[PDB]
């Protein structure tokens, strides 16, 4: 009941204010009672959005960062034509290290809108892609299964790729959003966008987010919040918070 009031007010004053005119998302602050005991990493666990799709994979600049020989993945995701129009750049990590050092890195940061890495390379990545990527929840590189094959123990896992599956995953990523755990109690998810959708979209988004986070099932991703949920403040980046639901 108050949420829409606070939302419209902040919307108005963020087109008004000069410094507030330059940023384009909304952050949500869920302050739990007890801290989540999960130690933080940068494996950004993903939450779904039932009603509305946030961004468009046919709008976002994408970097893809794969395993070593890169022959198979590059030729296939270029020649499948159901992904040929999909990725802006394909790079294996040997090339990434051999090509980008210094502040060409920061050139890549400002140039590329979303970075997605192979699931077995993500852990190695934070060196080469550098430190200024690992700021907040803006350009944390996500991680995707690529071959859709499980390595049974003591078995040479086959190396393969299916473009249908990879574009399915990326459509999932680009359609909904993602949180990241904390050793503390307050976290802020990324939701909304300024010009792209409106108040009922964002309100239903908020409801679905808090519902998924408070879902007592889906134990690695749903059953996560422990304790009583206290509050939720809506704000963009350079703003001041707006309080919602203080009970």
């Amino acid at each position: 009941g108050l949420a829409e009031k606070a939302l419209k007010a902040l919307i108005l004053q963020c087109e008004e204010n000069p410094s507030l005119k330059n940023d384009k998302d909304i952050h949500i602050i869920i302050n739990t009672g007890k801290k989540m005991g999960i130690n933080r990493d940068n494996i950004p666990r993903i939450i779904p959005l039932t009603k509305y799709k946030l961004f468009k994979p046919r709008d976002l600049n994408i970097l893809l960062i794969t395993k070593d020989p890169s022959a198979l993945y590059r030729e296939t995701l270029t020649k499948d034509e159901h992904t040929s129009e999909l990725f802006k750049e394909i790079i294996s990590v040997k090339n990434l290290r051999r090509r980008f050092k210094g502040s060409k890195l920061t050139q890549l940061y400002k140039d590329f809108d979303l970075v997605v890495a192979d699931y077995r390379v993500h852990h190695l990545l934070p060196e080469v892609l550098g430190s200024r990527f690992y700021h907040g929840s803006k350009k944390l590189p996500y991680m995707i299964r690529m071959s859709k094959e499980v390595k049974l123990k003591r078995q040479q896992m086959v190396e393969k790729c299916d473009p249908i599956y990879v574009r399915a995953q990326l459509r999932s990523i680009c359609k909904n959003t993602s949180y990241i755990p904390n050793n503390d109690n307050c976290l802020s998810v990324r939701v909304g966008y300024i010009q792209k959708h409106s108040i009922p979209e964002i309100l239903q988004n908020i409801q679905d987010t808090i519902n998924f986070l408070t879902d007592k099932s889906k134990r690695p991703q749903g059953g996560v919040i422990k304790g009583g949920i206290i509050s939720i403040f809506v704000k963009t980046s350079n703003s001041t918070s707006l309080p919602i639901y203080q009970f």
């Binding site: 009031k5 007010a9 902040l10 001041t240 707006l242």
Partner: peptide, 17 residues
């Protein structure tokens, strides 16, 4: 007319502390 209200809330809370 809500933004400056909650700003005053934050300000006055901390100076009261």
């Amino acid at each position: 007319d809500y933004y400056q209200q909650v700003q005053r809330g934050k300000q006055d809370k901390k100076i009261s502390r």
